[PDB]
Write a protein that binds this ligand. Structure first.
Ligand SMILES: *[C@@H]1O[C@H](CO)[C@@H](O)[C@H](O)[C@H]1NC(C)=O
Ligand SMILES: *[C@@H]1O[C@H](CO)[C@@H](O)[C@H](O)[C@H]1NC(C)=O
Length: 43
């Protein structure tokens, strides 16, 4: 968990979320398996 972890998580709140949180989530956390089939009703 570097300084960027908090930065990333904070800037996600600017509506950035996906692509920031996730990207860095990939490197920020060890648990990255919390997805769900939201809006995947034909996919
Ligand atoms: C993840 O982030 C990218 C940023 O361009 C966005 O296009 C995509 O829709 C996001 N995915 C979800 C499921 O939020
Ligand atoms: C199908 O895949 C897309 C990939 O971006 C994802 O939004 C979701 O899992 C599904 N989308 C819908 C509208 O079914």
């Amino acid at each position: 968990k570097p300084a960027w972890c908090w930065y990333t998580l904070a800037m996600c709140g600017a509506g950035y979320d996906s692509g920031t949180c996730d990207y860095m989530y990939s490197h920020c956390f060890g648990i990255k398996h919390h997805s769900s089939g939201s809006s995947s009703y034909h996919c």
